[PDB]
Design a protein around this nucleic acid. Structure first.
Lengths: 79, 190, 62, 137, 174, 108, 204, 87
RNA sequence: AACGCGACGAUACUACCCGCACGUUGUAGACGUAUAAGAAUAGGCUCCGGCCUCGUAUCCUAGCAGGCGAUUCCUCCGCCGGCCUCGAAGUGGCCGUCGGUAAUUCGCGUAUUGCAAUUUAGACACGCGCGGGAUCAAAUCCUUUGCAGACGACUUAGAUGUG
């Protein structure tokens, strides 16, 4: 396109205060609808979340998993 | 990622003279002299051994490191040009109207001129002025063949492109009208 | 149609100015200049050869 | 094959390279942390040229033309001090152009009002001989 | 972020008649001061365990200082940050002199690269890589190279910002 | 022939009044002392005489030059600019005009 | 170090247009006279077509009813492009602002009054000290030539004449410096012993 | 109408200025460029046309011509101009 | 551009030019208002020895606001001329005359402005005075013209003439 040689009308970034109140009212209204919809919540919520676990690139995943495994065993025999 | 060091090498043959100022590279060879300014690229030039030129950049990004690959081949092309040269061979074909090609060398500006006549019978005379240092001859080895040679690959290749574009058919059928001037072979003079 | 500022028309005019109009106007200028040639030919400080000084501003007044 | 290149000759930050700080003190590079920082130590006996062992940013430092030849990487204060005295870093630094300029600055700052008058009077006598010599040539 | 020190915080649930001598939990917390250090202890404990501030008690707050703040070390930080999508694991490496220096760099780096905030980042593990060959990230790997030495091209000199006018054009070579 | 100077004072420039974004206060002025680039350097000049010397039309008591006397009170900002309090506020047409900073009352 | 001068002649070559203008504007309001030379060698950061795009958008803005009066008068000369930047940096609709502008002078090239004066430089506005090495930049002289400036070639020819005279002046200059060093060497062996260490001990 | 002649005001002068002389190169011989005359009127002529490709080729055409009285001009001075960044 | 600029012609008085005498004259603001290479910044300068972060550098810088007389010195500054050079909004160099001149060292003088009070001191422009040189002008109204015209404006012509 010949934008450099013949530029068109600029798109003003000067915010008008009419939009700003109108833009803030919608943000408030939209936030309220999320909270109301999350209250109806016809959807199952569990307790334990999916823990991604130790990353593979961690250089000491051997020692940490060995540490955790022996932590379980010693606690199990103590309890 | 800001790689600390990255380097490349350009081996030179025995019969060359690579004189490189700040970033102006001059390569003298048996065929002649080539020159080129590459101050637009941040590169550190050095001599690593007897006959290999080292170019390196410190603390650059992948864009800056990759730019060294372009510099290596450009200077290498100027090395080839002064040693072996470049040669482009063009063939012009026609169906009914034989294309007339005239090659002359003029004293002023010292440049070769290629004049094309009778392209699909047109009466216009198309004149293309070759880049300086580009020699054009009509070969007496194959019919309708034009040899284009010189020391600079860019000048030889661009001049060959100029001839091809000017003899381009217009408002006709590509599948039916096959006339034109096309690059046939590319290589070195030696 | 092709405009008066078309690239192709300028190229054709340039050839016409160089190959047809040029020689004719050059011959005309030679004859005219010859006629005006015919009509016209019909110490440094003390002589003026040393060109010296005859008889708002750019800098700030110090 | 003839190649002549005149591009640039930088000074490299390396283990053994002694660098000058803004304080006028010196410190030899012992370890390179990254491209913007190094670990240095100035064991000079001169209090003015001394620097505690620690991290120095390279923006705050200047590279001197002196390099301790075979300073080990990670060398502690005892090892660095042994190389500092053996190479004679203090003597070589005193011979550098940077130290001469710094010394010239220090003398000029300490000038008192009476000394400035003496400098002016003594310079005019020196200038008188300089002018007579320049007149001949 | 800020200036940080490692804090050893030991806290316990308030001893009741049924449960004397409670568990005495412990954490290591990076905080600018002791007031923030105790707050993070109870915020973390309120999530993990069921011990609250009202029924809690801080046993000790201690500063862990680095054993060798003059030895250059490579650190590996395993952290979790939550974004608009969810909670993500990432492992990153920092070449520094102290753990507090490594953690401060991490907060700056996560803010610069992912716009992550302090309230969004959980520091799961900071470890000294005891030897090379434990360095996985290429940016650290290049710094631990053999005989590392580099120039400093295009060094801009430091001119006083109040020295508006200079008689000579500066040089960027030393 | 002395061919020397007679300057016993440090040169300054009257920049502006002590002002906010909109409101300006003529009672206090801002002075740029030549060669003063930091607050430490400005501390030398606190309590020093500063005189604004200007020329008038009518000769009153043997001269056409009038003087407004003031003091350097405190540094302003971090760039060596100082604050000055005069007997009368400066004419406000003298923004960017020379002032004289005397070396007395001296303590060195 | 904040020195005051009669007039500071700034060599505009290699300077970023906006950063020079902000520094120039502050000096004018402080009461210092500024002369900027070689405005055609000024630099604007970014790519060239972005600078061209901005000026073409500037050409769009024109008064509808009568372009002769009131409308934005678009100046194509390189110095007036710099002057526009400085004017927007100065409250030119006040008596104080107009007085500040009277302390400013802008030129293409180096007019003969100023070709023999010392050209200062502003490090905070120098392109080589400010721009990242890979970034692009454009020259005000090139943009001016493409929007209607008629005197690019004439200014270029005068620079060639100016620098040819500068070459002769520098050859004379090197001769004097060579003679000064020789005279200094000859006098140093004849002035006095005792004076010599007195100067050296004082740093001179 | 045309906006290329928009300020339809009376001419500032009765004479009229050239406003552009043809571009000069040193290769051509020395010559003058302009001259003055006084408008006399109009008259009709018959021209033997020699326009190849026209309908009136090898035919007689009647055309209108204007006569300008041109007494010789007297050269009484010389002016020199220099190139400046301001024109 | 009716508040942008250049070249040229003739300028009566007033005072046009030159010299010095001052102004109870105006200045968005003297007080050493000192300082010319060009070009690159992943390079440059050189005396070709070497040198380059750094103008915190170079020059000038002493004397009743800067006296008088020496001792001693050919160093620096200024005015005039002659030869040239400077046109982008126009100057500097060389030579000669004359005047001044601590690089060294003295003798005489400073007081009383009374313990500080802008150390009234520069440049430009403007005006008033003398004494030397120089010049003796135009425009408008008016009558007229119609290449012009609402009115102004404009193209013309009015002094001896191709009126």
């Amino acid at each position: 396109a010949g934008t450099i040689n013949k530029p068109k009308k600029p798109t003003s970034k000067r915010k008008t205060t009419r939009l700003r109140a109108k833009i803030s009212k919608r943000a408030a209204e939209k936030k309220r609808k999320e909270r109301k919809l999350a209250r109806k919540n016809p959807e199952w919520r569990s307790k334990l979340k999916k823990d991604p676990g130790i990353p593979n690139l961690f250089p000491y995943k051997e020692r940490l998993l060995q540490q955790r495994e022996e932590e379980r065993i010693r606690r199990k025999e103590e309890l | 990622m800001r790689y600390i060091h990255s380097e490349e090498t350009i081996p030179v043959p025995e019969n060359l003279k690579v004189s490189i100022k700040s970033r102006l590279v001059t390569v003298e060879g048996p065929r002649g002299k080539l020159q080129k300014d590459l101050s637009h690229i941040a590169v550190n030039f050095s001599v690593v051994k007897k006959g290999v030129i080292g170019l390196e950049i410190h603390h650059g990004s992948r864009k800056d490191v990759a730019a060294l690959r372009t510099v290596r081949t450009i200077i290498n092309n100027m090395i080839i040009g002064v040693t072996k040269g470049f040669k482009y061979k063009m063939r012009y074909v026609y169906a009914h109207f034989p294309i007339n090609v005239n090659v002359e060398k003029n004293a002023e500006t010292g440049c070769y001129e290629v004049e094309i006549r009778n392209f699909i019978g047109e009466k216009i005379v198309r004149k293309v002025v070759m880049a300086p240092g580009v020699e054009v001859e009509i070969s007496k080895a194959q019919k309708d063949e034009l040899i284009l040679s010189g020391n600079s690959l860019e000048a030889v290749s661009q001049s060959a492109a100029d001839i091809q574009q000017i003899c381009k058919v217009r408002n006709k059928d590509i599948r039916k009208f096959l006339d034109g001037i096309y690059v046939s072979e590319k290589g070195n003079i030696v | 149609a092709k405009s008066a500022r078309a690239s192709r028309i300028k190229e054709n005019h340039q050839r016409f100015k160089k190959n047809i109009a040029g020689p004719v106007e050059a011959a005309r200028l030679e004859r005219l200049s010859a006629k005006l040639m015919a009509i016209a030919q019909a110490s440094g400080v003390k002589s003026g050869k040393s060109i010296g000084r005859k008889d708002s501003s750019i800098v700030f007044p110090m | 094959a003839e190649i002549n290149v005149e591009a640039t000759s930088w000074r490299r930050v390396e283990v053994g390279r002694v660098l000058k700080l803004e304080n006028g003190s010196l410190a030899a590079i012992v370890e390179i942390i990254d491209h913007k920082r190094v670990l240095a130590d100035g064991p000079s006996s001169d209090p003015k040229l001394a620097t505690p062992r620690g991290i120095v940013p390279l923006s705050r430092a200047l590279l001197t033309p002196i390099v301790i030849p075979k300073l080990p990487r990670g060398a502690r204060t005892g090892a660095v001090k042994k190389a500092w005295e053996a190479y004679g870093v203090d003597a070589k630094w005193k011979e550098t152009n940077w130290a001469k300029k710094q010394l010239q600055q220090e003398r000029r700052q300490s000038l008192t009002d009476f000394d400035r008058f003496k400098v002016m009077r003594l310079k005019k006598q020196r200038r008188f001989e300089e002018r007579k010599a320049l007149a001949k040539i | 972020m800020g200036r940080l020190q490692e804090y050893q915080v030991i806290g316990r649930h308030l001893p009741t008649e049924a449960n004397p001598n409670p568990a005495l939990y412990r954490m290591r917390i990076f905080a600018p001061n002791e007031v923030v250090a105790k707050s993070r202890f109870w915020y973390f404990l309120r999530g993990l365990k069921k011990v609250k501030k009202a029924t809690g008690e801080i046993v000790s707050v201690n500063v862990i200082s680095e054993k060798h703040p003059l030895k250059v070390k490579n650190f590996g930080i395993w952290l979790r940050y939550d974004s608009r999508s969810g909670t993500h694991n990432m492992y990153k490496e920092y070449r520094e002199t102290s753990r507090v220096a490594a953690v401060e760099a991490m907060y700056a780096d996560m803010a610069a690269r992912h716009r992550a905030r302090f309230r969004s980042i959980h520091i799961l593990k900071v470890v000294e890589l005891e030897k090379t060959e434990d360095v996985k990230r290429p940016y650290i790997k290049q710094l631990v190279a053999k005989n590392l030495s580099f120039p400093l091209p295009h060094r801009v000199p430091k001119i006083s910002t109040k020295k508006i006018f200079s008689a000579k054009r500066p040089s960027t070579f030393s | 022939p002395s061919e020397a100077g007679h300057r016993l004072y440090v040169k300054g420039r009257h920049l502006s009044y002590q002002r906010g974004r909109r409101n300006t206060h003529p009672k206090t002025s801002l002075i740029k002392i030549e060669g003063v680039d930091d607050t430490a350097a400005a501390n030398f000049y606190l309590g020093k005489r500063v005189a604004y010397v200007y020329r008038a039309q009518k000769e009153v008591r043997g001269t056409k030059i009038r003087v407004i006397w003031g003091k350097i009170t405190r540094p302003h900002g971090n760039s060596g600019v100082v604050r000055a309090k005069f007997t009368h506020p400066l004419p406000a047409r003298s923004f960017g005009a020379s002032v004289r900073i005397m070396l007395y009352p001296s303590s060195i | 170090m904040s020195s005051f001068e009669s007039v500071v002649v700034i060599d505009g070559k290699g300077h970023l247009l906006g950063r020079l203008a902000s520094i120039v504007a502050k000096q004018l309001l402080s009461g210092q006279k500024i002369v900027v030379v070689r405005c055609e060698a000024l630099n604007i950061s970014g790519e060239f077509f972005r600078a061209k795009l901005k000026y073409h958008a500037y050409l769009r803005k024109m008064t509808r009813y009568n372009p002769t009066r009131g409308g934005p008068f678009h100046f194509r000369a390189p110095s007036r492009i710099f002057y526009k930047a400085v004017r927007g940096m100065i409250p030119h609709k006040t008596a104080r602002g107009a007085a500040a502008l009277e302390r400013l002078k802008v030129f293409e090239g180096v007019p003969p009054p100023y070709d023999k004066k010392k050209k200062m430089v502003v490090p905070q506005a120098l392109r080589v000290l400010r721009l990242q090495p890979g970034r692009k930049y454009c020259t005000v002289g090139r943009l001016s030539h493409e929007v209607g400036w008629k005197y690019q070639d004439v200014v270029a020819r005068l620079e060639e004449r100016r620098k040819a005279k500068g070459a002769a002046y520098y050859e004379r200059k090197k001769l004097a410096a060579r003679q000064l060093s020789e005279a200094k060497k000859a006098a140093a062996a004849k002035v006095d012993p005792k004076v010599s260490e007195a100067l050296a001990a004082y740093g001179y | 109408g045309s906006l290329a002649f928009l300020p339809r005001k009376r001419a500032a002068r009765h004479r009229g200025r050239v406003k552009s002389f043809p571009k000069d190169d040193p290769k051509k011989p020395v010559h003058l460029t302009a001259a003055m005359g006084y408008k006399a009127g109009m008259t009709t002529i018959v021209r033997d046309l020699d326009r190849p490709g026209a309908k009136a080729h090898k035919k007689e055409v009647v055309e209108a011509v204007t006569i300008i009285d041109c007494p010789p001009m007297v050269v009484v001075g010389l002016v020199g101009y220099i190139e400046t960044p301001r024109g």
